[PDB]
Amino acid sequence: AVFLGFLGAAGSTMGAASNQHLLKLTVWGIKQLQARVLAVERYLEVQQLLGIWGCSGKLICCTNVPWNSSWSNKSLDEIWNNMTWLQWDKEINNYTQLIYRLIEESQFQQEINEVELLAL
Amino acid sequence: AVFLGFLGAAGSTMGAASNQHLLKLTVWGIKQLQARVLAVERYLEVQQLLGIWGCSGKLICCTNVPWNSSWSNKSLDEIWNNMTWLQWDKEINNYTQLIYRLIEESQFQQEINEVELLAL
Amino acid sequence: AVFLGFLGAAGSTMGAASNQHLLKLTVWGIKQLQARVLAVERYLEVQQLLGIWGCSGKLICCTNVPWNSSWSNKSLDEIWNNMTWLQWDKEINNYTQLIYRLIEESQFQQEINEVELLAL
Amino acid sequence: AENLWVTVYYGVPVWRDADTTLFCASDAHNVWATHACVPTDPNPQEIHLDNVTEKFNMWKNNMVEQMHTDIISLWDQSLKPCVKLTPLCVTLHCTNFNPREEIKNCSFNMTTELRDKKQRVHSLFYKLDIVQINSEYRLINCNTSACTQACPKVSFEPIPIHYCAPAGFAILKCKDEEFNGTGPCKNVSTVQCTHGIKPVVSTQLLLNGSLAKKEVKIRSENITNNVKTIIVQLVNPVIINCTRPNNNTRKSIRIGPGQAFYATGAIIGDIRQAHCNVSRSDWNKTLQQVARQLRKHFVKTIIFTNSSGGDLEVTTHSFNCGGEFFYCNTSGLFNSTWENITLPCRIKQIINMWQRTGQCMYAPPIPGVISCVSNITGLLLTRDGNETFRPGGGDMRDNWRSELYKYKVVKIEPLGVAPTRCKRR
Amino acid sequence: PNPQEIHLDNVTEKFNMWKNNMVEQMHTDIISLWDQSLKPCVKLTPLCVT
Amino acid sequence: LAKKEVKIRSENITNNVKTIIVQLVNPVIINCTRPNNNTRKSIRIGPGQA
Amino acid sequence: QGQLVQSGATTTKPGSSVKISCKTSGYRFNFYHINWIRQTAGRGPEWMGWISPYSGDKNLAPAFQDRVNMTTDTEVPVTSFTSTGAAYMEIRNLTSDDTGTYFCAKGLLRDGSSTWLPYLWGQGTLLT
Ligand SMILES: *[C@@H]1O[C@H](CO)[C@@H](O[C@@H]2O[C@H](CO)[C@@H](O[C@@H]3O[C@H](CO[C@H]4O[C@H](CO)[C@@H](O)[C@H](O[C@H]5O[C@H](CO)[C@@H](O)[C@H](O)[C@@H]5O)[C@@H]4O)[C@@H](O)[C@H](O[C@H]4O[C@H](CO)[C@@H](O)[C@H](O)[C@@H]4O)[C@@H]3O)[C@H](O)[C@H]2NC(C)=O)[C@H](O)[C@H]1NC(C)=O
Ligand SMILES: *[C@@H]1O[C@H](CO)[C@@H](O[C@@H]2O[C@H](CO)[C@@H](O[C@@H]3O[C@H](CO)[C@@H](O)[C@H](O)[C@H]3NC(C)=O)[C@H](O)[C@H]2NC(C)=O)[C@H](O)[C@H]1NC(C)=O
Ligand SMILES: *[C@@H]1O[C@H](CO)[C@@H](O[C@@H]2O[C@H](CO)[C@@H](O[C@@H]3O[C@H](CO)[C@@H](O)[C@H](O)[C@@H]3O)[C@H](O)[C@H]2NC(C)=O)[C@H](O)[C@H]1NC(C)=O
Ligand SMILES: *[C@@H]1O[C@H](CO)[C@@H](O[C@@H]2O[C@H](CO)[C@@H](O[C@@H]3O[C@H](CO)[C@@H](O)[C@H](O)[C@@H]3O)[C@H](O)[C@H]2NC(C)=O)[C@H](O)[C@H]1NC(C)=O
Ligand SMILES: *[C@@H]1O[C@H](CO)[C@@H](O[C@@H]2O[C@H](CO)[C@@H](O[C@@H]3O[C@H](CO)[C@@H](O)[C@H](O)[C@@H]3O)[C@H](O)[C@H]2NC(C)=O)[C@H](O)[C@H]1NC(C)=O
Ligand SMILES: *[C@@H]1O[C@H](CO)[C@@H](O[C@@H]2O[C@H](CO)[C@@H](O)[C@H](O)[C@H]2NC(C)=O)[C@H](O)[C@H]1NC(C)=O
Ligand SMILES: *[C@@H]1O[C@H](CO)[C@@H](O[C@@H]2O[C@H](CO)[C@@H](O)[C@H](O)[C@H]2NC(C)=O)[C@H](O)[C@H]1NC(C)=O
Ligand SMILES: *[C@@H]1O[C@H](CO)[C@@H](O[C@@H]2O[C@H](CO)[C@@H](O)[C@H](O)[C@H]2NC(C)=O)[C@H](O)[C@H]1NC(C)=O
Ligand SMILES: *[C@@H]1O[C@H](CO)[C@@H](O[C@@H]2O[C@H](CO)[C@@H](O)[C@H](O)[C@H]2NC(C)=O)[C@H](O)[C@H]1NC(C)=O
Ligand SMILES: *[C@@H]1O[C@H](CO)[C@@H](O[C@@H]2O[C@H](CO)[C@@H](O)[C@H](O)[C@H]2NC(C)=O)[C@H](O)[C@H]1NC(C)=O
Ligand SMILES: *[C@@H]1O[C@H](CO)[C@@H](O[C@@H]2O[C@H](CO)[C@@H](O)[C@H](O)[C@H]2NC(C)=O)[C@H](O)[C@H]1NC(C)=O
Ligand SMILES: *[C@@H]1O[C@H](CO)[C@@H](O)[C@H](O)[C@H]1NC(C)=O
Ligand SMILES: *[C@@H]1O[C@H](CO)[C@@H](O)[C@H](O)[C@H]1NC(C)=O
Ligand SMILES: *[C@@H]1O[C@H](CO)[C@@H](O)[C@H](O)[C@H]1NC(C)=O
Ligand SMILES: *[C@@H]1O[C@H](CO)[C@@H](O)[C@H](O)[C@H]1NC(C)=O
Ligand SMILES: *[C@@H]1O[C@H](CO)[C@@H](O)[C@H](O)[C@H]1NC(C)=O
């Protein structure tokens, strides 16, 4: 529908992967209807985080929240040239909810500093 | 689903508030289905105005349309340090449709000035 | 629902045109339900291309892919001051899928050059 | 010395021929479920497309094939909660009536509120709804399908339906007056919904419709092909005046716990003949109008005759009037080769409507006197191959073609790429 | 399991329990829940005997 | 079929209550037929019911 | 593409008022100006005037200000971008000085600085 080409490099390192109409309530129609609703729900579910973090229309957006070393103690050579995006998630999956809240407020405080900056 | 935390400061001043699967057409299933469709409809209903005004991914975006004093004659101390976002809407709810059209075209004329600027 | 005002200048030149609730599965209810789903599907269908090309919230976004003259050999006076957006599509409709892939990767390579630039 | 780069444009005036689902809108209930449609905009906005000529084709439209299925679904959805007449398929014992329009007085055994008990009740049945067994008669439908009689609270009142296009799609309305129905149209505008279209079911004569702004316009596909239905659209409407004179009475039986079959009671007063009146020198005035336009395509004398023959619904001016379904004989209307004219009509109670595979409806007897007045705005002829035209009409979907010939559904493709001298820095 | 509640300090809203729609909507839901549950059950038409 | 060697699948092989599923590598052809030349006789148990 | 076939090479005598036709094919008749330019045998090529088949606006030369009547009937649509129009042009007090071949040409573009420029010429009608 979109693409599973992102998934091509699921075993590659993090540095390599990153670099008709009419509705009929038949058993297949109800099946194919929820698939259409379940797609736009899961799509906007991710797309509203990108918007609220100030990253809509971006694939790679840099933030302003420093990397708290308690989230991971590994080196940049141990991450981007060793771990895969699939296993790196399992190591950091505890702090993902703790990180998503910091990127959410780093964008919020950046917005009020701009409304004071452009007022000159 | 998202958050009603925005609503925490509904009585605060404008300067304080701003600062499983499977579908079954049972009576609850049809009820819970429209709630899912009514969410993505009302969400994009607001999100397309933000996009067409050149403010997607933004919480506070400054525009280029000057404040016509006929919309409100109050002072900046009478607004941000007195009125709440709930009552300020009732005072300006007449010109909201008249303002939403100016922000819509201020973005449109900004786009053609950029296509002439980046051509150098 | 949105606007067919874009369509006002369907015969104009390219330079002129550019410049209640409750769900009931009655025959009309199922009809009006898919219209609601078919709208948000076709809307995001276009809106995800704008996002993946780095053009979300934009009406006119300049890119970095040069114009391969094999797509069209006409002059800028033959295009913007002669052809209409309706007939220009028929002339270029062969390479539209070939162009949409270049704008997709021009944005992708721009993202990795920014993550190296802002690292200084 | 150009340096052109691809530029993306969002919101460009370009569309594409497409078919989608059209939802309904209505103004401020009947079978058409107009209470379920969204309220129409009191100011129907229209955007004129200057310098635009689009190719229409009223005969390869999908609004027709989609509206036809909606009316059939609106019909069947309204008969779902109504009473089934399975026990009414019993052996009838009928006699004639009084010392055309034959009526019988039939007595039969019928069930009641209690399963073990019966009742000997009698009812009037029009001769057309009933066949002889070989005087023991039988309802004409019992050998092929069951029948569901209409819930007597719903009405067949045709009221305007607005077909709208979804968000992201559009409807192109051809505004050229003398538009042939097919080919380019020089006066094209876009709309969100169509106008108010009344689902008026009729045969041969198109009742209650949109007129030609000037000169009786004729529409078809292959005019040289006689198997293709011709559709006339009058410019000035001749008024047909119909009435069933007999003062009928409703007699409610009780064929079960909650099931009440409404039988035709007595006929209070005179026994007359149901019929329709249209004005001579007005049907004759508007038939020489259809005449001179039929010869513009066929060089030659043109003749008018009656229907071919066969079923009653095919060879008659079948329509609806106050609740009962008339079947008028239009041999006196199409009878001229180029004061009133009365059409003898029969009235049926067992109708199949959409010519479906075994599904009928018992039209209950409307008590009192019936009378309706209907404009005759359209026509549908059928050539043979002395260019004679018999009033036929072909299919039922041609009714909706006569009103949808101006509209066409297209989808918006608001994305467009074009070269400019700007580069993303 | 933890029903979150957000207090709206400094806020006074006008209610009207008699012109609410939650009532007219719940009433129709219970009637639909009632009729939906009786759809697959046995009809007692033959029990209407003498 | 199995691309090579008849593969066998199960959950707890040591448990007999778990169904074993064999998947052959080469298909043996079964040939079935009901020989009696039957005829269809359509009754009419009601208006439209046959 | 497109072709602007002209009328017949008919020649009258001084005092007449001959009409020259110019029917088009293969392009939108309303989208471009029509233009008439003559080539006098004893003069340089002389531009006479253009008219807009859409707006219905005229602009002629001072030497033909009150001597030339040029008109255009509406187009017969063929497809979304093809029409079949026609362009007619007359002369008033015609003399022997107006002897020469006459041309009809369509506009260059439909916007910009050179909108009406005679780009696609016809075939030519020889006069008196
Ligand atoms: C539908 O399609 C038609 C045809 O395709 C479009 O009509 C064409 O539009 C273009 C652009 O708008 C026109 O090009 C311009 O031409 C004018 C010349 O007209 C001037 O001269 C006349 C005679 O001297 C004069 O009478 C005019 O004055 C007014 O009077 C008329 C009366 O009808 C009125 O209609 C006019 O609009 C005037 O108000 C007029 O002054 C020329 O001036 C233009 O040049 C300027 O603009 C361009 C930019 O566009 C710029 O680059 C130039 O340097 C200069 O600044 C321009 O050349 C063309 O003449 C039209 N007709 C054709 C091609 O036959 C129509 O617009 C389309 N409509 C829609 C809704 O899509
Ligand atoms: C032929 O059919 C007619 C049915 O349409 C019969 O009924 C007559 O129709 C006339 C036309 O409408 C009526 O006259 C109209 O009266 C109203 C009331 O004042 C006026 O507004 C109309 O202008 C007027 N029309 C005309 C043309 O005068 C008659 O009133 C009506 N008859 C009766 C008794 O009411 C005709 O009777 C019928 N003729 C024959 C010979 O069968
Ligand atoms: C269709 O035909 C019917 C009957 O042929 C027409 O109905 C007739 O309408 C006229 C209108 O004036 C009635 O005349 C008036 O009747 C009243 C009551 O009797 C009387 O007081 C007046 O002085 C006047 O005579 C007439 O009675 C009525 N006839 C019947 C039988 O109802 C109807 O108008 C026609 N519709 C058309 C032509 O659109
Ligand atoms: C063509 O259109 C005309 C008018 O739009 C239709 O006449 C209308 O007929 C209906 C009944 O079929 C009349 O409405 C109802 O009458 C009954 C009987 O009294 C009443 O109970 C209802 O409350 C309602 O009044 C309606 O008055 C009448 N309209 C006019 C102007 O007289 C005609 O039936 C249409 N023809 C077809 C074939 O649909
Ligand atoms: C399954 O078994 C049936 C019957 O045991 C097989 O059908 C047989 O197929 C052969 C194929 O050649 C038929 O032989 C030919 O019959 C025609 C007509 O009689 C004759 O002209 C030829 O010379 C040749 O003998 C044979 O008649 C037919 N038998 C029957 C009873 O229909 C079928 O092939 C088997 N399917 C398999 C093994 O996949
Ligand atoms: C249901 O009854 C109708 C009416 O009798 C049948 O149509 C008749 O078919 C017989 C065939 O033997 C003809 O003799 C009659 O002339 C037909 N009548 C009409 C009015 O056409 C119809 O075939 C029956 N349906 C079934 C399924 O048997
Ligand atoms: C039957 O036809 C008549 C005549 O066309 C219709 O009466 C016209 O109605 C329109 C709309 O209100 C008016 O603008 C005209 O002035 C009316 N004409 C006359 C002579 O009164 C009438 O509405 C049509 N009725 C139906 C049911 O189609
Ligand atoms: C049709 O016949 C019925 C009787 O079956 C008439 O009904 C009577 O109408 C009068 C009107 O003045 C009433 O006073 C009576 O009470 C009615 N009788 C009954 C039993 O209801 C009816 O009027 C007749 N229809 C017409 C048009 O005359
Ligand atoms: C149809 O026939 C029945 C006969 O079965 C008629 O009913 C009779 O009506 C007369 C007149 O009121 C009574 O005296 C009898 O007692 C009735 N007989 C029965 C068995 O009910 C009935 O009237 C006839 N229908 C019509 C419309 O004439
Ligand atoms: C419709 O009415 C006409 C008369 O108005 C009927 O015409 C008769 O038809 C029979 C059968 O073919 C002929 O023998 C007669 O000569 C006709 N009489 C005429 C023309 O005056 C016709 O039968 C009727 N049709 C229906 C289906 O009822
Ligand atoms: C099964 O029996 C039926 C008869 O009940 C056979 O049908 C006949 O088939 C022959 C084929 O040559 C036809 O000519 C006859 O008209 C058929 N009779 C009827 C009444 O339809 C059928 O052939 C038998 N099946 C086989 C396989 O032999
Ligand atoms: C009703 O049924 C009885 C037999 O049970 C029969 O004798 C009688 O004639 C029937 N009456 C009718 C069909 O009217
Ligand atoms: C209808 O008119 C158009 C004119 O554009 C013509 O091309 C077409 O052949 C005509 N068709 C019929 C059936 O008259
Ligand atoms: C198009 O229709 C409108 C309707 O009023 C009319 O005013 C206009 O002149 C028409 N244009 C053409 C080119 O037919
Ligand atoms: C047809 O017209 C002829 C001649 O006017 C007439 O004799 C005949 O009765 C008419 N037939 C019908 C059915 O009106
Ligand atoms: C199937 O094979 C896998 C090999 O990865 C083994 O771990 C597992 O125990 C086996 N299970 C059975 C039921 O044979």
XYZ file of C-alpha atoms in Angstrom, chain C residues 1-12 14 17-18 20 25-29 31-32 34-35 38-40 42-43 46-47 49-50 53-55 58-68 71 74-76 79-80 85-86 88-89 92-93 96 99-100 103 106-107 110, chain D residues 2 4-16 20-24 32-34 36-39 45 47-52 54 66 70-71 73-74 77 161 163 166-172 190-192 411-425:
134
model
C -16.423 19.938 1.909
C -13.177 21.604 1.119
C -13.155 23.576 -2.095
C -13.748 23.275 -5.816
C -12.476 26.853 -6.216
C -9.151 25.496 -7.241
C -11.052 24.305 -10.215
C -12.109 27.801 -11.229
C -9.286 28.184 -13.617
C -9.371 24.806 -15.296
C -9.169 26.430 -18.736
C -6.717 29.144 -17.740
C -0.637 27.272 -15.978
C -4.233 29.053 -12.462
C -1.145 28.738 -10.252
C -26.150 14.776 12.905
C -26.633 0.861 8.301
C -29.467 1.978 6.053
C -28.850 2.148 2.308
C -28.085 5.855 2.707
C -26.082 5.345 5.902
C -23.543 5.116 1.306
C -22.674 8.163 3.417
C -17.919 5.076 2.708
C -17.946 8.648 1.388
C -13.149 7.504 0.887
C -12.430 11.171 1.651
C -9.786 10.683 4.349
C -7.802 10.029 -0.887
C -6.761 13.043 1.205
C -1.889 12.916 -1.611
C -0.780 14.282 1.761
C 3.530 12.280 -0.940
C 3.835 15.916 0.144
C 8.947 14.833 -0.519
C 9.634 17.347 2.260
C 6.727 19.592 1.294
C 3.466 23.848 1.398
C 1.476 24.813 -1.689
C 4.493 25.398 -3.965
C 7.768 23.744 -2.943
C 10.928 23.978 -5.026
C 13.011 20.809 -5.258
C 16.592 19.921 -6.199
C 16.028 17.463 -9.080
C 17.023 19.091 -12.403
C 14.525 19.101 -15.255
C 15.481 16.247 -17.570
C 10.296 14.778 -20.041
C 8.817 22.974 -24.541
C 9.823 26.490 -23.527
C 8.835 28.297 -20.344
C 4.194 26.041 -20.736
C 3.173 28.701 -18.226
C -2.759 22.258 -16.016
C -5.317 19.800 -17.424
C 0.001 19.555 -19.394
C -0.726 16.462 -17.298
C 3.837 14.398 -18.938
C 1.683 11.586 -17.494
C 5.007 11.331 -13.448
C 9.590 12.062 -11.408
C 7.820 11.207 -8.139
C 11.694 14.016 -5.582
C 16.200 14.145 -3.303
C 14.481 14.720 0.040
C 18.921 16.129 1.842
C 17.703 28.147 -18.047
C 15.048 24.318 -14.705
C 14.107 22.169 -11.714
C 11.027 20.130 -10.858
C 8.509 22.069 -8.760
C 5.633 20.416 -6.892
C 2.218 22.103 -6.966
C -0.605 21.205 -4.562
C -4.084 22.149 -5.755
C -3.896 22.282 -9.554
C -7.071 22.315 -11.703
C -6.867 18.791 -13.148
C -9.331 15.921 -12.753
C -9.815 12.354 -13.966
C -17.252 6.477 -6.755
C -20.092 6.262 -4.233
C -22.581 9.145 -4.211
C -24.338 9.967 -0.951
C -27.769 11.567 -0.729
C -36.894 6.862 -0.359
C -35.553 7.255 3.224
C -34.992 10.980 2.718
C -31.518 9.635 6.446
C -29.904 12.083 4.001
C -27.889 15.088 5.181
C -29.492 18.554 4.862
C -22.825 26.756 -4.817
C -18.322 27.170 -9.863
C -18.202 27.975 -13.574
C -15.259 26.502 -15.496
C -14.473 29.154 -18.092
C -12.495 28.065 -21.176
C -13.303 24.411 -20.374
C -15.462 18.366 -21.295
C -25.818 3.424 -9.261
C -30.228 2.598 -4.895
C -33.931 2.871 -5.743
C -32.441 -1.080 -2.449
C -34.638 1.729 -1.101
C -35.302 -1.973 2.509
C -32.969 13.298 -4.191
C -26.712 12.941 -5.310
C -17.356 12.738 -1.809
C -14.639 15.097 -0.651
C -11.801 14.971 -3.164
C -14.143 14.222 -6.084
C -16.287 16.488 -8.240
C -19.347 16.572 -10.489
C -19.245 18.317 -13.873
C -18.573 22.049 -11.480
C -20.931 21.311 -8.581
C -20.786 19.271 -5.394
C -11.926 12.740 -9.261
C -9.464 15.489 -8.348
C -5.720 14.940 -8.882
C -4.458 18.100 -7.152
C -0.791 17.133 -7.592
C 1.259 18.490 -10.479
C 4.976 18.840 -11.225
C 6.303 21.482 -13.617
C 9.724 23.039 -14.286
C 10.683 26.387 -12.771
C 13.889 28.394 -12.366
C 13.918 27.894 -8.577
C 16.144 25.442 -6.710
C 15.848 24.320 -3.090
C 18.848 25.930 -1.383
